[PDB]
Amino acid sequence: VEGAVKTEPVDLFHPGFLNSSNYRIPALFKTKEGTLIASIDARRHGGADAPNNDIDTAVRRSEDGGKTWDEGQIIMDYPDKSSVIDTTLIQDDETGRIFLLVTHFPSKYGFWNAGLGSGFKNIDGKEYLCLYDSSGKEFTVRENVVYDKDSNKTEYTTNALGDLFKNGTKIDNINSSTAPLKAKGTSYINLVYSDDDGKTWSEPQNINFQVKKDWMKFLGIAPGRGIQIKNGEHKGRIVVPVYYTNEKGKQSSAVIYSDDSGKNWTIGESPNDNRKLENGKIINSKTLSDDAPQLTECQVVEMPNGQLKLFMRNLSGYLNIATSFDGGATWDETVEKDTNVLEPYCQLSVINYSQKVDGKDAVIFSNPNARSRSNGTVRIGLINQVGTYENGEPKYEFDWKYNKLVKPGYYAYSCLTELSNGNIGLLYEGTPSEEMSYIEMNLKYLES
Ligand SMILES: [Ca+2]
Ligand SMILES: [Ca+2]
Fold first, then answer.
1. Structural domain for 436, as ranges
2. Domain count, the chain
3. What is the DSSP-derived secondary structure letter of residue 194?
4. In a 3-state reduction of DSSP, which class is residue 166?
5. Do 80 and 142 belong to one domain?
6. Domain check: are 44 and 167 in the same one?
7. For this structure, is 247 an active site residue?
8. Which among 101, 122, 134, 447 counts the fewest CB atoms within 10 Å?
């Protein structure tokens, strides 16, 4: 239609960019200053997941609304097949700080073989990263100084990137396959930040000691974006979707969040905690022993009153949606199955939209609308209150009134953003692990 915009795809990441053969896992975010930040996994040895790769985090920026992009940079790169995978972007609008979080594994580890727990030990009221020698003896890192099990200082120190120094000389890195002292082989959540609109980034902080429980095996970022709550009693809270496995390997979604501008973090309950399944069975994420109720990668949006909605990858074939009345600390016992939205067991993107559509608050959604990773479709969901819960809170559901096919054929992970002009940017996996495509769309197109 006249005035509709759907730009021809640009390969924002592609084989050879930053000398990486492969790319996967898009994240896309517009900063308060109007800059677009795109992050991605630079998968250097193919498209495979950790541990069968060496994966770094790459970032590109656009200062002109996505028309042109910079030359890129690598912002986290560990040695020897230690990988960072699955990025997410969020900003604290009060401080202008941008956050990027990612999952990190030492060499040889990934989802399936992750060890239990955080990899930290409490010594006299502070958590310290553990290191292990060849015989399995346990050491702790205390303000970057390595102590043995009898609390004697050793000759070793570390840095934030895991380099291992003997008397001040680098000898290895605690994430490698050869270091004489190694971190526990498990997942870790890393956090970096930028105070200059994404041009430069801090070195990673390992926040596992705050967010990973002793009974979790894997805990990872659910890739895409987070939110900062705009309304109500938890205004300002930074919310970052995650998912984890228990000791039996079964997956449940949650969010981690910060009320102090990213300094400290907490993990909330999963929607699988005290979940009431369809016919009344009650489950918990710690004890879940069946595949069918699993909840995995997810993205979160906010309702007009501040209520949160967690949209989740799951095994039902359809979108699942959880509701939180308390800023992501806990979820209502009922997970909605929205049979109007196919979910082929793939990551999805959902965002709030800043203007009403047809008189209603709205969200924008992207996923493969099929029983396979194909038929990539962007939707506009209109929020409607459909009643109240027994506790008197509003109950909201979505009217998926506008649904537009944007990518025939292959379509896997994706990430949306609203642009400064009110249009929609989208970065998507239109190939398995090679070209990652960016387009801009307007609502005239999406509603046509
Ligand atoms: Ca690397
Ligand atoms: Ca619950």
1. 1-118+185-448
2. 2
3. E
4. strand
5. no
6. no
7. no
8. 134
Mark whether 173 and 302 lie in a shared domain: no
Q: Does 145 lie in the same domain as 38?
A: no
- Domain limit, last residue, from 184, 199, 216: 184
Q: Which long-range contacts (CB under 8 A, 24 or more apart) does 350-355 make?
A: 350/299, 350/300, 350/301, 350/311, 350/381, 350/416, 351/225, 351/299, 351/301, 351/416, 351/417, 351/418, 352/227, 352/301, 352/302, 352/418, 353/380, 353/418, 354/418, 354/422, 355/422
Q: Is 338 annotated as a binding residue?
A: no
Among 184, 210, 227, residue at a domain's last position:
184
Measure 44 CA to ligand 1 centroid, in angstroms.
Answer: 8
214 flagged as catalytic: no
- Catalytic residue selected from 297, 361, 429, 440: 297
Q: What is the DSSP string of 299-363?
A: EEEE-TTS-EEEEEEESSSEEEEEEESSTTS---SPPEEEEEEE--SS--EEEE-SS-BTTB-EE
- Which listed residue (49, 336, 429, 440) is catalytic? 49
Cα 440 to chain center, whole Å? 22
Q: Is 188 annotated as a binding residue?
A: no
